[PDB]
Design a protein around this ligand. Structure first.
Ligand SMILES: *[C@@H]1O[C@H](CO)[C@@H](O[C@@H]2O[C@H](CO)[C@@H](O[C@@H]3O[C@H](CO[C@H]4O[C@H](CO)[C@@H](O)[C@H](O)[C@@H]4O)[C@@H](O)[C@H](O)[C@@H]3O)[C@H](O)[C@H]2NC(C)=O)[C@H](O)[C@H]1NC(C)=O
Ligand SMILES: *[C@@H]1[C@H](O)[C@@H](O)[C@H](O)[C@@H](Cn2cc(CNC(C)=O)nn2)[C@H]1NCCCCCC
Ligand SMILES: *[C@@H]1O[C@H](CO)[C@@H](O)[C@H](O)[C@H]1NC(C)=O
Ligand SMILES: *[C@@H]1O[C@H](CO)[C@@H](O)[C@H](O)[C@H]1NC(C)=O
Length: 497
């Protein structure tokens, strides 16, 4: 309903500029009339989910690329899409004027925006915090009598989450992940570095750490927030590494297996939070299928594990088929879920590239590849960062789909925002991935979903410079004649009856 105000910062595409008085907006999603299709188009050139409509033809003739919908070939159901309410994200959002804050929250959580239904919530501090803390820093408090939420939760994160839920028309799923335990539960007595829980699963250290999960869910419940899921630990492989620079807690796959079996599983299951899902791994997919094999071949661990959370940071060294594909094959009833992604974290990556089309394409390519390998959802990292890509107590700066410029009471919606939106806006929870087969080899990335009501949603990404004319065949309905421009992303919607 309100167009993008474009601004170039000298990179491959534009950001859309928002402030207290203006932000670009979309309409709530709707399917067009039977026999018509909708096309939402974003381009490097600067189109931002521009709506065009076309007819569905009874016949098609030609030798060009055909993508044929396989609507009765059913894969995973979709949980959803969203991002992380870090301390850094909360600080950036609340540094804006209240009207600017509302337009940023609407961008993500409104049907005028991209309809996020997932918020990941750190359990106390991570790198994207300005101070180091846990919920239980009083030494040797095994009873956790001194467990409490500081202001980072009560003043920043929780009130922002309430405002997001109020804007959300869809049910929102909260996902909790811890970086570090209290240092007095750790072998190394520090938030960072190589260090695990003292002792072994089944003991006072592991029982106390399990009870910390319940104390956290209790405290959020007192604040009228309920969680869909928790992870067993953020990137447990990190705490196994000498000199690891920020908050971590090391687990081998065997350590995680026994902790889940003996401590975390039984503790959650024997609490009011017994319906909260437990996701294992929450780490790079290079660790699959090995981590899944170690944890899930133990039936006493398996009975507590709902799903396998994956991070994207080693995807470039970890082919999807050998990792996601093999894991699904071995454990088809254990959902795969992408829980953390950002650009700018790598040695060779600039922290923030305002308007980067490449970074948008990174997001959509990842989401498509994940969806094609049974993954049920995809979660961004920081919801918002400053132009340096912070704040961050170890100066570990990265990129975010929204960059806040507090001196101008402004925020910038980057390509990543729109690329994520091409999925989140149009793929409600309960959508199911269906087959989509190419007539010939092509440079496109494409995924088909059946909306809960039986309607079709197809996303087509062209990471090539070349315009690709194509046809989409829906065998029951007809043919969509279209064109995939170089460096474009499209979402197609059509009814099937
Ligand atoms: C929040 O951001 C808003 C958009 O960046 C700000 O509003 C804008 O303010 C500037 C400066 O006064 C105006 O720019 C001038 O632009 C007009 C052209 O106007 C119209 O055409 C543009 C371009 O296509 C179109 O986007 C608008 O809808 C208008 O119809 C020129 O004639 C001038 O020479 C000068 O360049 C913008 O017109 C104006 N945009 C809008 C959408 O209102 C607003 O100031 C910011 N708020 C705060 C508190 O800073
Ligand atoms: C996920 C992690 O949970 C989060 O705290 C972090 O900010 C993410 C992005 N990231 C990484 C870095 C610097 N990396 C290192 C190794 O210090 N800055 N931001 C992300 N962490 C991913 C680590 C992957 C390393 C693989 C070798
Ligand atoms: C479509 O193709 C069929 C099969 O050749 C043909 O007989 C029919 O007349 C065509 N229908 C339309 C609506 O073009
Ligand atoms: C920890 O909790 C106990 C029991 O409520 C209290 O008496 C004690 O003073 C607390 N310690 C700190 C450091 O707050």
């Amino acid at each position: 309903a309100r167009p993008c105000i474009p601004k170039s910062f000298g990179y491959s595409s534009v950001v859309c500029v928002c402030n207290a008085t203006y932000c670009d907006s979309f309409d709530p999603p709707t399917f067009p009339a039977l026999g018509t299709f909708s096309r939402y188009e974003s381009t490097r050139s600067g189109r931002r989910m521009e709506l065009s409509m076309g007819p569905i033809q009874a016949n098609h003739t030609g030798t060009g690329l055909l993508l044929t919908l396989q609507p009765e070939q059913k894969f995973q159901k979709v949980k959803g899409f969203g991002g992380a309410m870090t301390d850094a994200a909360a600080l950036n959002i609340l540094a804006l004027s209240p009207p600017a804050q509302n337009l940023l929250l609407k961008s993500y959580f409104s049907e005028e925006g991209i309809g996020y239904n997932i918020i990941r919530v750190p359990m106390a501090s991570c790198d994207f915090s300005i101070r180091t803390y846990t919920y239980a820093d009083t030494p040797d408090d095994f009873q956790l009598h001194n467990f409490s939420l500081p202001e980072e939760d009560t003043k920043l994160k929780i009130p922002l989450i309430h405002r997001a839920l109020q804007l959300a028309q869809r049910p929102v799923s909260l996902l909790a992940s811890p970086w570090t335990s209290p240092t007095w539960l750790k072998t190394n007595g520090a938030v960072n570095g190589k260090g695990s829980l003292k002792g072994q699963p089944g003991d006072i250290y592991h029982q106390t750490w399990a009870r910390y999960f319940v104390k956290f869910l209790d405290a959020y419940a007192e604040h009228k927030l309920q969680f869909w899921a928790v992870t067993a630990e953020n990137e447990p492989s990190a705490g196994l590494l000498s000199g690891y620079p920020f908050q971590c807690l090391g687990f081998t796959p065997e350590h995680q297996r026994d902790f889940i079996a003996r401590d975390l599983g039984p503790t959650l299951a024997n609490s009011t939070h017994h319906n909260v899902r437990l996701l294992m791994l929450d780490d790079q997919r290079l660790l699959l299928p090995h981590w899944a094999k170690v944890v899930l071949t133990d039936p006493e661990a398996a009975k507590y594990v709902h799903g396998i959370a994956v991070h994207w940071y080693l995807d470039f060294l970890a082919p999807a088929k050998a990792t996601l594909g093999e894991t699904h094959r071995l454990f088809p009833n254990t959902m795969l879920f992408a829980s953390e992604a950002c650009v700018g974290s790598k040695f060779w990556e600039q922290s923030v590239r305002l308007g980067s089309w490449d970074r948008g394409m990174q997001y959509s390519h990842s989401i498509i590849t994940n969806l094609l390998y049974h993954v049920v959802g995809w979660t961004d990292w920081n919801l918002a960062l400053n132009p340096e890509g912070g704040p961050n107590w170890v100066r570990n700066f990265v990129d975010s789909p929204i960059i806040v410029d507090i001196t101008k009471d402004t925020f910038y919606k980057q390509p990543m925002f729109y690329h994520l939106g091409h999925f989140s806006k149009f793929i409600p929870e309960g959508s199911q991935r269906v087959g989509l087969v190419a007539s010939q080899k092509n440079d496109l990335d494409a995924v088909a979903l059946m909306h809960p009501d039986g309607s079709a949603v197809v996303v087509v990404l062209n990471r090539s410079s070349k315009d690709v004319p194509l046809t989409i065949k829906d065998p029951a309905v007809g043919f969509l004649e279209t064109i995939s421009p170089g460096y474009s992303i499209h979402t197609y919607l059509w009814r099937r009856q």
